[PDB]
Ligand binder design. Structure first.
Ligand code: FPS
Ligand code: MG
Ligand code: MG
Length: 535
């Protein structure tokens, strides 16, 4: 709607594409030489890996990076003996855990007083505190030291900002303000890269190869997203549900972000398109589960979603028939596209996994239609089904050629705890963040409203309460993300962690929660419109 016209008419020069692809391929060997240098230490390699992570460029070298870290993790106790640099320990902490190696929080005891707290002497290390702050968002459920590290660096970094000196180094100041507002692991990979490029450009001594490589890499990535949004807009318009339905909302860029969060790299382009098509479609089905649909309509709609057919013509009203027909047609076409690539089984899973989302959605509708506000505890039993994180992960698996089909779906239907925790996060983040919309539409059965109902707390007190439930399940996702390495493909685990990080950017606003449309406007043009000018 808003941006649909824009993407349809933006011009992508295939010659610009080909040149970015070539310059990237031309520089890749030089960067690779840096990682495999026999002259740099393990510490120096970890520093570089983190820099390639920061710049959204690690994936070009994922085989090498994983191997470097598998080996030097075995040497980690030795690498850190007498390593007293706060930012160095914190950088190793980020790199090793991001790559599935659970580096112990005992690493920070060297920065901790006898009281127990982190030494006040750390306040001179403005960079160390920033990197400590960032890694405090990588804690497992038992590591309460990280919540104390986050509070320590934040307050000590806030003091620096409000004071005297912080002025003198503006580019660093701005980077720290950005990081405190949107922590790296509360942000998605490509936006972290976008901002770190601006920051790295202003660091005296920045490597010019890596900077230029990161810019080329970002502009290449962004070229794909625009082409993907263009493709999706054409697809959505040819489907033309807007002509046959009244209540269709504009979820184009939100739906693309639904693929972009999980994976930003160019080789996941097709996967992003598949995910965005499925989301825009299933989102129409979810809007159809509406308190203003009657008992017979919702009964028949739910039943058609169990059978996956048409009705007989033994059935009900027109807009509702149009929606079921479209869903079956969209999913049938996607399955046909994916059949040559031997991935049609995964497309089939979409509507199979959705059958229980539909039955859950039917119950939600009865609550809203009668105006019953359940207990919070009883609401969630339905709400974690409707959250569908197992379905969401299947969508992303479809366009990932190196995730064996029955490997991945084995896992999902084994109900991994990581998918359980993601369900809590999405359900809570979505219902609090969209609360004003929900009350407007009469959806009074929701996570926030049921918690106020149960505990007599106000909206703000319930907001804070479900926040903590949300933080806890995020730590569960982190610990599950690490513990499942060498048991679950890393490619699969990364989508899971990116779900968590995507939910922070879409929904979290300071200490409570907000609507994603407002959050998307903050990074819309830098992500989808303007390339980085190349030095
Ligand atoms: C992060 C993002 C935008 C998309 C990924 C989430 C997935 C997999 C599907 C979209 C779910 C829905 C219906 C969002 C609509 S706002 P709502 O309050 O109506 O959603 P609900 O109906 O509560 O599920
Ligand atoms: Mg609904
Ligand atoms: Mg909701």
């Amino acid at each position: 709607s808003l941006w649909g016209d824009h993407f349809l008419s933006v011009s992508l020069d295939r010659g610009e594409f080909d040149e970015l692809e070539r310059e990237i391929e031309t520089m890749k060997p030089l960067v690779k030489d840096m990682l495999m240098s026999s002259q740099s230490s393990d510490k120096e390699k970890i520093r570089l890996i983190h820099l390639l992570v920061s710049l959204g460029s690690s994936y070009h070298f994922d085989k090498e990076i994983q191997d470097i870290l598998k080996h030097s993790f075995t040497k980690l106790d030795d690498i850190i003996v007498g390593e007293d640099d706060l930012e160095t320990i914190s950088i190793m902490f980020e790199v090793f855990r991001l790559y599935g190696h659970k580096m112990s929080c005992d690493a920070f005891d060297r920065f901790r007083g006898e009281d127990g707290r982190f030494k006040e002497s750390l306040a001179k290390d403005v960079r160390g505190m920033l990197q400590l702050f960032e890694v405090a968002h990588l804690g497992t459920p038992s590591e309460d030291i990280m919540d104390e590290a986050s509070s320590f660096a934040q307050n000590h970094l806030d003091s620096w900002i409000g004071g005297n000196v912080s002025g003198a180094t503006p580019h660093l100041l701005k980077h720290i303000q950005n990081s405190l507002y949107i922590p790296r692991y509360c942000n998605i990979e490509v936006l972290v890269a976008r901002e770190y490029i601006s920051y790295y450009e202003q660091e005296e001594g920045h490597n010019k190869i890596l900077l230029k490589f990161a810019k080329l890499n970002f502009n290449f990535c962004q070229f794909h997203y625009i082409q993907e949004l263009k493709t999706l807009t054409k697809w959505w318009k040819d489907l033309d549900l807007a002509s046959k339905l009244p209540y269709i909302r504009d979820r184009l860029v939100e739906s693309h972000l639904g693929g972009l969060g999980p994976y930003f790299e160019p080789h996941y382009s097709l996967g992003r398109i598949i995910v965005a098509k499925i989301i825009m479609t299933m989102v129409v089905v979810d809007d159809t589960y509406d308190a203003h649909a009657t008992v017979p309509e919702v009964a028949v709609l739910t039943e058609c979603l169990q059978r996956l057919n048409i009705g007989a013509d033994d059935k009900l009203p027109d807009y509702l028939r149009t929606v079921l027909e479209s869903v079956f047609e969209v999913m049938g076409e996607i399955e046909q596209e994916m059949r040559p690539k031997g991935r049609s089984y995964g497309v089939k899973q979409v509507l199979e996994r959705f059958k229980n989302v539909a039955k859950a959605d039917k119950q939600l509708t009865e609550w809203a239609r009668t105006g019953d506000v359940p207990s919070f505890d009883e609401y969630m039993k339905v709400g974690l089904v409707t959250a569908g994180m197992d379905g969401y992960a299947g969508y992303c698996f479809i366009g990932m050629e190196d995730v064996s089909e029955k490997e991945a779906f084995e896992w999902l239907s084994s109900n991994p705890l990581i998918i359980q925790a993601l369900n809590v996060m999405f359900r809570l983040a979505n219902d609090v963040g969209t609360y004003e919309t929900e009350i407007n539409r009469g959806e009074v059965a929701n996570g926030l409203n049921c918690y106020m109902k149960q505990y007599g707390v106000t909206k703000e007190e319930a907001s804070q309460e479900l926040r903590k439930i949300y933080s806890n399940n995020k730590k569960v996702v982190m610990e599950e993300f690490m513990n499942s390495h060498d048991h679950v493909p890393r490619q699969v685990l990364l989508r899971c962690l990116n779900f968590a990080r995507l939910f922070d950017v879409m929904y979290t606003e300071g200490d409570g929660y907000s609507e994603p449309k407002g959050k998307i406007e903050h990074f819309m043009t830098s992500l989808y419109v303007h390339p980085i000018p190349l030095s």
